């Protein structure tokens, strides 16, 4: 009967809102958010999306994924390994462990990769249709809060440098979306995958806001 | 030999089998930091998953792509779970437990593929069975120390296999028998894709008593 973006937003309405109504939103939005905490969420970020673009790459001569590989216009690694250098140093990835909550979220996006590729449409809108809509917000919000530069360093993962008009390509997106050749079955099964997908930022979130309330204890 | 159906398995699943290897509450587990209530959770998981495991075996008994897989008395762990939750919660364990949302999903699909897909079951007793003979003796072990369980095996009964003299050549002659089924290459493939959705079942189970965990 209906599109699958349109499934999509209104399948995720409760979870898109819980999602706003976390603590490390909040503290994030109204600009109380410390370095150190910064650098965990960032760390949660890099192996989030190194897994997501890495099951992407797999499937994206994949007709029931194809159309939405858009390595050039969305993909993060390149900048979110520009931000981990920035904030951890030179060797950082022989010392970086991923957070339990992002860890279990990437378990999730390799399964779905490697054997439900059909479903990874789930992840992908989850994840890149709200860096799209929020990145610009954000993006100012944290370089003031943690006194960043303006030139851009550690917070490049909010600036896409290859999408002219976010607006415009998130309405390419939802067309590509809905071209793809699906059962009502899948459709189901995807918004269900979304719903999935929400929780596991759920989960990051709320170890991020724990991991704060250690960070008070400490200072 | 690597049309072998039991050498597609394993090379099929092995990126699943890492992952369920190196997930949380296995680590966890292991390292002797699960406590009474989430072992009371985890074996309560076991208990429903294995009843509608050997529920959907005991239907496909005689189904031609199943039944040499049919080993009541010698792998059948509903039993041992039965004791095991008695030992925990007591005489009125049943109405003392629910199942938990992940177990419910795996349940549902063990239901769907006995009653649907019988072709198919083969992968959700193998991913089940062939685990269980392999690390039982350790997992034992490991819960006995951690909770102060009795030598004498209660609470653990399901990690013991009364009725397998050795694990090691039983494992062999189930993929004998696996290798033995008239199937084609195309549900050979679809016995593999269950197999890994059975890794998964499992993951969300994991997961879910991770989060119990906090
Ligand atoms: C930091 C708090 C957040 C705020 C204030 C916020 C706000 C917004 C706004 C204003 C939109 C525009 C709706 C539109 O596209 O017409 C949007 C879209 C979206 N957001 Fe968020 N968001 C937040 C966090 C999140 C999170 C954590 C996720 C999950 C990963 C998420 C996922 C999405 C998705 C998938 C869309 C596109 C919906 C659609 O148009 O189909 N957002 N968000
Ligand atoms: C730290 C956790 C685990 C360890 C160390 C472990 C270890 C092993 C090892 C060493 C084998 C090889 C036995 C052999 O080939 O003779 C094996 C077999 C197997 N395990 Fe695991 N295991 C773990 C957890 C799991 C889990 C969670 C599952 C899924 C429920 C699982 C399912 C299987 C299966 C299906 C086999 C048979 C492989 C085959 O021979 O085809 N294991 N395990």
Sequence with gaps: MADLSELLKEGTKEAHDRAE????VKDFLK??????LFKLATTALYFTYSALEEEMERNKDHPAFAPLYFPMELHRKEALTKDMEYFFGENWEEQ???PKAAQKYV???????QNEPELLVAHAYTRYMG???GGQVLKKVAQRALKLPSTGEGTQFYLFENVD???????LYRA???????????KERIVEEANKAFEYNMQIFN???????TLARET
């Design 96 to 98: 970086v462990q991923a």
């Design 21 to 24: 109504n976390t603590q490390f």
């Design 131 to 133: 860096d799209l809509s």
């Design 207 to 213: 170890e991020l806001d724990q991991a704060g309330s």
């Design 107 to 113: 378990e999730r996006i390799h399964y779905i990769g």
């Design 176 to 186: 590509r979306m809905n071209a793809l050749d699906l059962n009502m079955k899948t």
């Design 165 to 171: 008009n976010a607006q415009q390509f998130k309405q």
């Design 31 to 36: 600009g109380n958010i410390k370095k150190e």
